[PDB]
């Protein structure tokens, strides 16, 4: 099988961290910044890593059964289809959100509905946040019971003076959590390409969430199950009307994309209607032409 990437323009691609559409590419202000996102992670051969699910509609979702303690309430987590979550070789159930170090606000419904079926579960990333072992605590102004299924609606700071940094991941343990490994900028002047989406972040530097692979790229790799035939895949980002090559990018086997950004610029200066196309297999050391 021959490796391809989706024939879909950037703006029709979904974020792999939050339920939203991609609106631009960028590079990090610190081009040496290392990330360890647990969603949007998939090898070129189609191996899912971390908590990464297959579908865009599994991204940043939570399902579980409500339980009561002396102190309050929690969810005993299940997979999103309701099957049992077993602590094995994943940080959390598939699709579980990976926006670290902040409060989450998750809108859920009970899976004969009457009145208002929604509950907003407010979740702190403090001590009883133990998704790896299979439970989290929440508070809610509503009264959720039983089998609740929902989606991350918005995020806010853990404490009043603080901010939300969407570039961080949670601490899944309460303990080895089987995390997808860190991603380093791989040298040769290359910077990791991040795909950004608008998302309601309260007290963030911006209201945007980065990811390292568009969700449709993930499912494409899973479907295709293609053999890696080189150290990197050279891609062109192409204008779909003129077929002009707008810039060179490298797609690495571990499942992320790089470019060489022009000083003070980068892929954030490119049109957002282009399509990535596989060009050829290249050596790890292939030197890219600068973009932006």
Ligand X SMILES: CC(=O)N[C@@H]1[C@@H](O)[C@H](O[C@@H]2O[C@H](CO)[C@H](O)[C@H](O[C@H]3O[C@H](CO)[C@H](O)[C@H](O)[C@H]3NC(C)=O)[C@H]2O[C@@H]2O[C@@H](C)[C@@H](O)[C@@H](O)[C@@H]2O)[C@@H](CO)O[C@H]1O
DSSP string, 212-230: SS-HHHHHHHHHH-PPP-S
Give the distance, in angstroms, between the CA of residue 20 and the centroid of all CA atoms in the same chain: 11
Taking the complex as a whole, the smallest distance from the CB of residue 210 to its own copies amounts, in Å, to 16
Encoded one letter per residue, x for contact with its own copies by CB under 8 A and - for no contact, window 112-151 reads: xxxx-xx------------------------------x-x
* Contact in structure between 44 and 3 (CB atoms under 8 Å): yes
Cβ at position 80, least distance to ligand X in Å: 24
Please list every residue from 51 through 70 that binds ligand X, using CB under 6 A: none
- Choosing from 3, 17, 20, 136, the residue that interacts with its own copies (CB under 8 A) is 20
Q: How far is CA 130 from the centre of its chain?
A: 20
Is position 99 an interface residue for its own copies (rule: CB under 8 A)?
no
Answer for which of 128, 173, 186, 200 binds its own copies (CB under 8 A) is 200
Residue 107 to residues 120, 149, 154, 238, 268: CA-CA distances in angstroms? 5, 8, 9, 38, 32
Least distance to ligand X, CB of residue 68, Å: 17
Cβ neighbors of 191 (< 8 A, separation 6 or more) are: 27, 28, 31, 185, 258, 259, 260, 261, 266
Size of the site for its own copies (CB under 8 A): 49
- Report what 287 binds from ligand X, its own copies, none; CB cut-off 5-8 Å by kind: none
Does 8 engage in binding with its own copies (CB under 8 A)? yes
The listed partner (its own copies, ligand X, none) that binds 52, CB under 5 to 8 Å by sort, is none
Instruction: Please report whether residue 174 would count as binding its own copies according to CB under 8 A.
Output: no
Q: Mention every residue, 6+ apart, whose C-beta is less than 8 A from residue 30.
A: none
Q: Is 120 helix (H, G, I), strand (E, B) or coil?
A: strand
Q: Which two tokens stand for residue 266?
A: 């980068």
| 157 forms part of the interface with ligand X (CB under 6 A) | yes
163 CB-contact burial (10 Å; exposed 0-12 / middle 13-18 / buried 19+): middle
Nearest-angstrom CA–CA distance, 168 and 172? 12
Report the residue number, 128 or 186, with the smaller CB distance to ligand X. 128
Binding mask 110-139 for ligand X (x = CB under 6 A): -----xx-----x-x--------------x
d(CA 263, CA 27): 11
Q: Mask of contacts with its own copies, 43-72, x by CB under 8 A?
A: ----------xxxxxxx-------------
Residues in the chain that come right before a backbone break, where C and next N are over 2.5 Å apart: 111, 174
Choose between 81 and 175: whose C-beta lies nearer to its own copies: 81
Which residues of the shown chain bind ligand X in the complex (CB under 6 A)? Answer: 103, 115-116, 122, 124, 139, 156-157, 159-160
């Amino acid at each position: 099988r021959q490796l391809t990437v989706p024939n879909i323009p950037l703006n029709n691609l979904a974020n792999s961290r939050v339920p939203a559409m991609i609106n631009k590419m960028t590079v990090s202000t610190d081009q040496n910044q290392v990330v360890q996102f647990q969603n949007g992670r998939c090898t070129l051969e189609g191996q899912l890593l971390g908590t990464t699910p297959v579908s865009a509609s599994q991204v940043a979702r939570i399902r579980g059964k409500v339980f009561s303690t002396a102190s309050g309430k929690g969810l005993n987590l299940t997979e999103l289809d309701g099957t049992p979550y077993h602590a094995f070789e994943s940080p959390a159930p598939l699709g579980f959100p990976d926006i670290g170090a902040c409060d989450w606000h998750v809108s859920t419904f009970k899976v004969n509905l009457s009145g208002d079926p929604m509950s907003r579960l407010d979740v702190k990333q403090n001590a009883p946040f133990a998704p790896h072992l299979g439970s989290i605590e929440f508070t809610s102004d509503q009264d959720p019971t039983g089998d609740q299924l929902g989606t991350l609606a918005w995020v806010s700071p853990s404490t009043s003076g603080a901010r939300v940094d969407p570039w961080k991941i949670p601490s899944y343990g309460s303990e080895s959590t089987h995390l997808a490994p860190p991603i380093f900028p791989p040298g040769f002047g290359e910077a990791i390409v991040y795909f950004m989406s608008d998302f309601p972040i309260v007290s963030g530097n911006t209201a945007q969430v980065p990811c390292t692979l568009p969700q449709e790229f993930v499912s494409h790799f899973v479907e295709q199950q293609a053999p890696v035939r080189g150290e990197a895949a050279l891609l062109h980002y192409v204008d779909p009307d003129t077929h002009r090559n707008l810039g060179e990018f490298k797609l690495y086997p571990d499942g992320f994309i790089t470019c060489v950004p022009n000083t003070g610029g980068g892929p954030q200066n490119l049109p957002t209607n282009g399509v990535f196309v596989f060009s050829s297999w290249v050596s790890r050391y292939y030197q890219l032409k600068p973009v932006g």
